[PDB]
Amino acid sequence: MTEYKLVVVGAGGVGKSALTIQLIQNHFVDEYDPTIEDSYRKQVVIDGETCLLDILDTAGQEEYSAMRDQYMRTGEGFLCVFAINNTKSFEDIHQYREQIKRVKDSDDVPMVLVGNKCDLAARTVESRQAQDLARSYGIPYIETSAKTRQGVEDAFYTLVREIRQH
Ligand SMILES: Nc1nc2c(ncn2[C@@H]2O[C@H](COP(=O)(O)OP(=O)(O)NP(=O)(O)O)[C@@H](O)[C@H]2O)c(=O)[nH]1
Ligand SMILES: [Mg+2]
C-alpha cells in the first residue's frame, strides 16, 4: 500500500505529540512528556484508499535540530503546529517553514498550518492572523484541539490529500 511519511514540527509544548496520539490511540495525553523523536505507523483508509501513515513526531527543543533535519528530509508532508495561546510559537512558524524549505530543497512542499489548543479560551493568536499567514504560504489553515479531538483527522487527512495533489 501507499505509504505517506508525515512530519509533525513546531515549538516545544504546542501539542505535536498529543495531536498524533489522539489520531493513533484516541486518547488525550495531559502529561508533561517532551519528545526526542518518535515514529508511529498506522494503516488507515482515506477516501477508499488503503494507505500507511508513517508519522514522524519531532522535538520542539533546539538541541535536536540536526536530528530534526535528518527526519524532515524524508518527509513527504509536514504539519506545522503552533498553539493559539502561545504567540511565540506562532512567530516561530516562519522559522520552521524555512528550515523545511532548506532540507527539502523546495519552495512548496505539502504542508498544513495547524493552530492547536483551540479548546482554550485564553487565545492570543486570532484565527484571522493564522489564516492570513497560511494564505501567504499557499497552504491550508486548520484549527485543532488534541483535547476535544476537533480537527485532528481533518489536519492529517488534509495533508494526505495535499500529497496526492503534489
Ligand atoms: N488544552 C489543550 N492542551 C493541549 C492540547 N495539545 C496538547 N496539550 C497539552 O500541552 C502540553 C504539551 O503537549 P505535547 O503534545 O507534549 O506537546 P509537544 O509539541 O509534543 N512538546 P515537545 O516539542 O517537547 O515534544 C501537554 O500538557 C498537553 O496535555 C490541546 O489541544 N489542548
Ligand atoms: Mg512531543
Swiss-Prot record:
Outcome (variant: Q61V): Strongly increased transformation of cultured cell lines
Residues the entry annotates as binding GTP: 13-18, 29-35, 59-60, 116-119, 145-147
Effect of S17N: Dominant negative. Prevents PLCE1 EGF-induced recruitment to plasma membrane. No effect on subcellular location of isoform 2
Biological processes per GO annotation: adipose tissue development; animal organ morphogenesis; cell surface receptor signaling pathway; cellular response to gamma radiation; cellular senescence; chemotaxis; defense response to protozoan; endocytosis
Chain span(s) of sequence motif Effector region: 32-40
Disulfide bond positions: none
Sequence positions bearing N-acetylthreonine: T2
Cellular localisation: Cell membrane; Golgi apparatus; Golgi apparatus membrane
Pfam family, one: Ras
Effect on the protein upon substituting D119N: Loss of GTP-binding activity
PTM note: Palmitoylated by the ZDHHC9-GOLGA7 complex. A continuous cycle of de- and re-palmitoylation regulates rapid exchange between plasma membrane and Golgi.
PANTHER family: RAS, DI-RAS, AND RHEB FAMILY MEMBERS OF SMALL GTPASE SUPERFAMILY (PTHR24070)
The protein's name in its UniProt record: GTPase HRas
Source organism of this protein record: Homo sapiens (Human)
